[PDB]
Amino acid sequence: PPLDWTQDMGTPKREGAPVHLTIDGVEVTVPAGTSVLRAAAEAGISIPKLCATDNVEPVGSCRLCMVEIEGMRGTPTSCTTPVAPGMRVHTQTPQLQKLRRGVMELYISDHPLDCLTCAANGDCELQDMAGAVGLREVRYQAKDTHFARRDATGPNPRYIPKDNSNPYFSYDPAKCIVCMRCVRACEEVQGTFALTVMGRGFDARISPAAPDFLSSDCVSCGACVQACPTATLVEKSVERIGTPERKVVTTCAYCGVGCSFEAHMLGDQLVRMVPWKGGAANRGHSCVKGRFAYGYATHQDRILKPMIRDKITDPWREVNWTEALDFTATRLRALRDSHGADALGVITSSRCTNEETYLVQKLARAVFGTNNTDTCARVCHSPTGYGLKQTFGTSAGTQDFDSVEETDLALVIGANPTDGHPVFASRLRKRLRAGAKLIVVDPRRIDLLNTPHRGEAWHLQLKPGTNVAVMTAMAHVIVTEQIFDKRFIGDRCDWDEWADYAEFVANPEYAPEAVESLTGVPAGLLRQAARAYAAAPNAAIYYGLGVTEHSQGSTTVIAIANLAMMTGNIGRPGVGVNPLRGQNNVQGSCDMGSFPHEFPGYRHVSDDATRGLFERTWGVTLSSEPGLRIPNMLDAAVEGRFKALYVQGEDILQSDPDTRHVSAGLAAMDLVIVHDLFLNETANYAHVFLPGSTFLEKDGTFTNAERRINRVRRVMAPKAGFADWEVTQMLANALGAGWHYTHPSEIMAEIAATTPGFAAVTYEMLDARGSVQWPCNEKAPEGSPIMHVEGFVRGKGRFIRTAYLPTDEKTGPRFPLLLTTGRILSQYNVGAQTRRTENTVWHGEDRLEIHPTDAETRGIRDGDWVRLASRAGETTLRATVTDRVSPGVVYTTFHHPDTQANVVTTDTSDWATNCPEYKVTAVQVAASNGPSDWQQDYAAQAAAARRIE
Amino acid sequence: PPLDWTQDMGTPKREGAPVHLTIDGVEVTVPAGTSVLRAAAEAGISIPKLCATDNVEPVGSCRLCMVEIEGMRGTPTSCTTPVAPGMRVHTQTPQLQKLRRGVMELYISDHPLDCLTCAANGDCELQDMAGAVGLREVRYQAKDTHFARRDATGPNPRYIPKDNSNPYFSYDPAKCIVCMRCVRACEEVQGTFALTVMGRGFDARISPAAPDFLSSDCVSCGACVQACPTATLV
Amino acid sequence: AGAYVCGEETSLLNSLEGKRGTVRAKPPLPALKGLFGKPTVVNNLLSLAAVPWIIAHGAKAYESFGMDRSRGTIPLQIGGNVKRGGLFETGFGITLGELVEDICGGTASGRPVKAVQVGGPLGAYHPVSDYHLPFCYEQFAGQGGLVGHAGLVVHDDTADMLKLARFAMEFCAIESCGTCTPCRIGAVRGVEVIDRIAAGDASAMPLLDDLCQTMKLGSLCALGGFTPYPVQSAIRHFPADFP
Amino acid sequence: TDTARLRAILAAHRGREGALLPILHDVQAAFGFIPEDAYAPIAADLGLTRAEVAGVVGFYHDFRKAPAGRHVIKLCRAEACQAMGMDAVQARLESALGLRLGDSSEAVTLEAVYCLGLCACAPAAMVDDRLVGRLDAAAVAGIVAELG
Ligand SMILES: Nc1nc2c(c(=O)[nH]1)N[C@H]1C(S)=C(S)[C@@H](COP(=O)(O)OP(=O)(O)OC[C@H]3O[C@@H](n4cnc5c(=O)[nH]c(N)nc54)[C@H](O)[C@@H]3O)O[C@H]1N2
Ligand SMILES: Nc1nc2c(c(=O)[nH]1)N[C@H]1C(S)=C(S)[C@@H](COP(=O)(O)OP(=O)(O)OC[C@H]3O[C@@H](n4cnc5c(=O)[nH]c(N)nc54)[C@H](O)[C@@H]3O)O[C@H]1N2
Ligand code: SF4
Ligand code: SF4
Ligand code: SF4
Ligand code: SF4
Ligand code: SF4
Ligand code: SF4
Ligand code: SF4
Ligand code: SF4
Ligand code: FES
Ligand code: FES
Ligand code: FES
Ligand SMILES: [Mo+6]
Ligand SMILES: [S]
């Protein structure tokens, strides 16, 4: 396999022609740009280096990679020396030995001999490069030192006390070798310039412009802590625990970017998690959550034994597996025989693997005998799979995340990658700092707009709801003008429909000059943005929950796809219409059924040719009717004719709209099973509880946003004793199915045999290649990094006439303001995993980003308590005046359940997939002291219902 | 290929019937005579060890390979603990972490911090087993030490000057951890008993019965130099 | 903004760019990629003051002045302890003997001269014995020295070479971006080694030599690659002052 | 009237290429130092981060981190000026004011500059935007006389 994974090469890898050079008697062939050091590394000949890493560009600080080259005067550095044809270099001459010894001498003259009692013993790059060169003595009796606490005559002015402000890593400058691999990484990789070198010369010290890291502009990504060789910046888990011995490759259980980590393990005790330098999702980078927040698995609140209740008002009962399953199955069979198989249902979890998802959809279809299954996809990115299905034919992405490396423009509708998908935002900024342009259509100023060293940028600060009017105006601009590609249309798309589309869009009513009244965006700016998007050679659209989660989501997505097809930004690296999927395995869950209208493989349920194959493979008779969706489920349960429910890895209460209605519908439910790690908001209405397994104790795969199948390995052992798929098969066999799975490999084999795309998928492949894009059959064995490269999937694109319809959530006298709900970098959606970590520092209370002018009239001030008098409920929250949002707009967060935010949210939803309207709600923000009438009752219920006996 | 090559297992390999045991949640099958440490090694679960090598028979000097076993009182050593059928052992409990920390503390209290300027940097078994257990502080302000050239009020009587008589290896006792993997190797493997432990207790120092190695009964085989973890014999 | 290291082309154009004047490595030359990644011609004033003269009065005229390799007129700036200081514009090939003993007399104090430092503090200490050495790049760079902006100071017998050799490193220390180690730590350690030499230690002089050599061969720029020259010159020319 | 001045300064240097250095010069010239309450606005208007704006301020010596005294006295410490007895001038003057090299106060601030171009006039000083040369042990009298 590649060496970039196991071995830290000196400099970043370059593209160029083959250049032959002789490194210390070894022939080598490397691209022209490639340095001497990286080539020597590729040749096996290692040259000492301390300040050079692959993550960042080389700098001549250490002077330890010096090599004698024929034709060059003196001892030049390999890191900053590009290879040339026929060059004969000598890695280790006597003179160089001497010089390197001298340099290490100068280092260690200013370094504490705390080796043998330091955190980074065995994982320090100064120690091995000090032993490598062969330092045997330090002749400099130093008086001026940074580490010495007390100097002659008193305190050392240079000494800087340790900084343990950040709960995840610590900064001890006493051991700093100024090399600036922290600065370089924070600036080049992450893109948040929070570190600098304060001072000039020996007095130079790394520092953020603040007393401590926490108070600074640091988001806790640990790219400095990963790139710091000398324990200056060090994880605290490595201080408390010893330095780890083994490594295991797993992936993050967040964000759907699928950052591939390697957990460093000392026995069974997880010491830390560090990126792998593998996976095209993250090339050795991460964020706070995946990097550090993994302590929920080792939390005391975790539930480890089954629990049966028999009545929500009654207390729990710690119980073994057998009788738990017995009781469950008994009640299930009773309800089944009484009300029918359609009186049941499941709610799969994206958070889980795709194997478990397959087992669950089987449990719902084969065993129960119904098509009533669903998942988180239904509140997020369900309209995407309708729009891109109606237009292209695939309900999935279009490009990978490496494509962005070749883009020339980025159009962001309804996304905030700096929080939602940090590692994508990093590689975005990597390009924005390199000339590429940016359009942002969000109504709220995102931090992606205020990135440092930014190129050009446009910001369409519109009014929430009017997202299709803007797209229609873009289209009107591009069509009234003539910038679109006619060749692209004529080749990959249809013309007869395009003519109608143009004759419709060309109407002067959908023009930028008329929408300014309702949209709120200027006309000139919009025209300019449109022209810029159309003119650029390789533009790329990235969209999220600002389009999908609305009354018109599928429509907006369709408009966006129309744009992308018209302009010609499809079927090439650097161009495409990418939805930014959320939870891990949302793609994999949706692919493995997890929908009430399909089988694994996005095949409809009414398809006889498919139902036949599945009845043949499972040996059971299936239904042809599509099932209910969560809204339908709850409305039914309120009306009746729905009694059972098996909630897997989901919080249907806090993470769903109209908390009142969903609660009322979850209450009127004779049986509602829960299968999560922790006791949740949803388990307050539960009758049964089955523990779960974390991604550390699991084994399987995750299908991320870019259709990539990453492999998840087992590092710990299940504390409950059983993984989620084991529990699912337990239940299934206890009901009467008769499954026998001893490993998810068999399950994946089943999947491959059943649905196409995964037909060539095998864990061996995933191990060898590392990662695969799921469209991988005998044709395209390696994978499909880019979709629609050669003609679309349906065969010919389709231009659909989109239009703007006034939303039913318009605002009035008693509900003048609008509302929005979003996210933060530190905390995850419901924070059942993340509130149980040290990420409650950056965000420990949800707040309301109100506008100043909309605050003075009401009397609101930063830090005050306000009430959100809406139509579908009421809530109280801590305010925050900020010029981030526009006037007549509000922004809340749902991470914390102490504040019931989704009680404000209304039942209004999309038309196709019924994805709720989270991003628009007519509210009234007033000043108040008493929290609420709903929050009180919720707290009371949660207190009286989370009691164990 | 075999692990005996790449990995230094704890104790010599024994002949016997198949015995099944559970090492820290991992099923293992090893001959009866085989120790807990070697089985844990074969299982992938590494237990800290400094005085145990495959070349020679195990001794209970380091006390760093302690493991909590069900049915056994206290924290017995794996090196000197033969496996038994059905035995469930726990490699890393909190108490054991604490105890190993303490033992490494006692070691390093009498060891020079010449790391970063010593010959065996990266190839020392005291350094990795001091970092492995996670030592973060030494609370013993030592006055009695072997390495200190000059003690309070004058020369250290314990200090023994380096020996570079042999042109191939050198003996710096200032860094000796008495474990006797040199003695054990010279006596068990080579078969020429030229090394002994002169003294009783803290005063115990490795030595040949002669001024320097060269004048002794040493044939220069380097089995002590191969088995010395802490750069004393280098 | 008060930095001697901002005279280096890289650091200079780095300071122009709004950043901090840290010297860059040299895979790309400022000519190829300089200010804002765009090609830039970075030159000294004396070089851009002769351009008009050169192109107008005829290049063939400007080539008439000088030695075999070095061609043209240079100003020689003469300061410090010297009777007639100031500026002397002339063609190369002139011996500093003439420039310092005849043209500019001797010293202001009236004492003899023990040192004559060509170049700035990055220049060797040429004594009276080197009066037979003409002014040109090649010959001076051959005779263990340096001639740059033609700086030329003078010190009389009442000067201490120890103080000056220490000042050299002190300068290299206070004036240092801090990019590479041989100047970061090297200088502030040499400043201690020199004090130790002053004390009387014998384990300092060879130490000093090794330090100077690693500084010469390792330092990224010339602020820590020519700093050794003052030291070594003051040591090998004036040993009666260094115990 | 700090925000006003700063905004005016930033408006004066709008659109330039590498305008951080000039902006900082103007800021220092206005107040006397780079206040930490002016690291953020500069960074914002230039699109930088507080970190870089602080690093730039730290690297350069001409940018004060705190104000100086009513008067300032820079005194070369380079080779030439050293040659003709800068040490003596320094000693005399620091005895006169009672402030050693680098030691500042509310009255004055004695510091080094390492050149002024007055190399021929070896002993050279900068007192409040006034250069002085040939600083004998007598000129110091007038240096301090006009400098209370
Ligand atoms: N106001 C507002 N509300 C929203 C949204 C919004 O934008 N605004 N977004 C909607 C969308 S985008 C979605 S994704 C949802 C997300 O939010 P949810 O659908 O609630 O999913 P999670 O946040 O993972 O937590 C749900 C439960 O599953 C548990 N769990 C986590 N990992 C595992 C595992 O590996 N195995 C098992 N057996 N259980 C596990 C968690 O610990 C937790 O108890 O929120 C929705 N609600
Ligand atoms: N640290 C962290 N990471 C996460 C998550 C988390 O909670 N924390 N959530 C995960 C999940 S499951 C999700 S779905 C994904 C996706 O996460 P994103 O795609 O980033 O969606 P959000 O952050 O909810 O908000 C989208 C942005 O668009 C704005 N907007 C609001 N209304 C409109 C409108 O009408 N038109 C337009 N053009 N824009 C509008 C919103 O105010 C907001 O700024 O991220 C995943 N990653
Ligand atoms: S950072 Fe490395 S060299 Fe420095 S004390 Fe720690 S282990 Fe030793
Ligand atoms: S954790 Fe990440 S953002 Fe914070 S200083 Fe380190 S590299 Fe920069
Ligand atoms: S903190 Fe670490 S990475 Fe940064 S300069 Fe110091 S040693 Fe290098
Ligand atoms: S939350 Fe997203 S960006 Fe952060 S580590 Fe997990 S997958 Fe990567
Ligand atoms: S023997 Fe090992 S622990 Fe002792 S000084 Fe040498 S490297 Fe350090
Ligand atoms: S080298 Fe000498 S002392 Fe060491 S093991 Fe061999 S015979 Fe014994
Ligand atoms: S010389 Fe080496 S092997 Fe022998 S007792 Fe000392 S440390 Fe152990
Ligand atoms: S020698 Fe000194 S001034 Fe020159 S680049 Fe290196 S650190 Fe900077
Ligand atoms: S080793 Fe290449 S310069 Fe640091
Ligand atoms: S570790 Fe087994 S006794 Fe030394
Ligand atoms: S050297 Fe002080 S005047 Fe130029
Ligand atoms: Mo989501
Ligand atoms: S999602």
Residue numbers in the entry:
A (entry chain A): 7 to 955
B (entry chain E): 7 to 240
C (entry chain B): 251 to 493
D (entry chain G): 2 to 149
Task: Give sentences from the paper.
One of these oxidoreductases, the metal-containing formate dehydrogenase, catalyses the following redox reaction: 1 CO2+2e−+H+⇌HCOO−,E∘,=−420mV In standard state, the equilibrium of the reaction favours formate oxidation at the active site Mo or W atom, which is energetically coupled to the reduction of oxidised nicotinamide adenine dinucleotide (NAD+) in cytoplasmic FDHs e.g. from Rhodobacter capsulatus and Cupriavidus necator. Subunit FdsA binds the bis-MGD cofactor, which coordinates the Mo atom in the active site together with the conserved Cys386 residue.
To solve the structure of the functional RcFDH complex, we subjected the as isolated, azide inhibited sample to cryo-electron microscopy (cryo-EM) and single particle analysis. Subsequently, we generated a 3D reconstruction with imposed C2 symmetry yielding a final reconstruction with an overall resolution of 3.3 Å as determined by gold-standard Fourier shell correlation (FSC) at 0.143. The EM map around molybdenum indicates six ligands coordinated in a trigonal prism geometry. The rectangular base of the prism is formed by the two dithiolene groups of the bis-MGD molecule coordinating molybdenum from one side. The two remaining coordination sites are occupied by the Cys386 sulphur and a small ligand that is oriented towards Val592. There is no clear evidence for stochiometric binding of azide in any particular location of the EM map. Conversely, azide inhibition of RcFDH under the conditions used in cryo EM is not mediated by stochiometric, direct binding to molybdenum. Two tunnels can be identified in RcFDH starting at the molybdenum and separating at the active site residue Arg587 into different exits. The two Cys121 residues are located directly at the dimer interface and lie within good disulphide-bonding distance, but the EM map suggests they are essentially coordinated to their corresponding cluster.
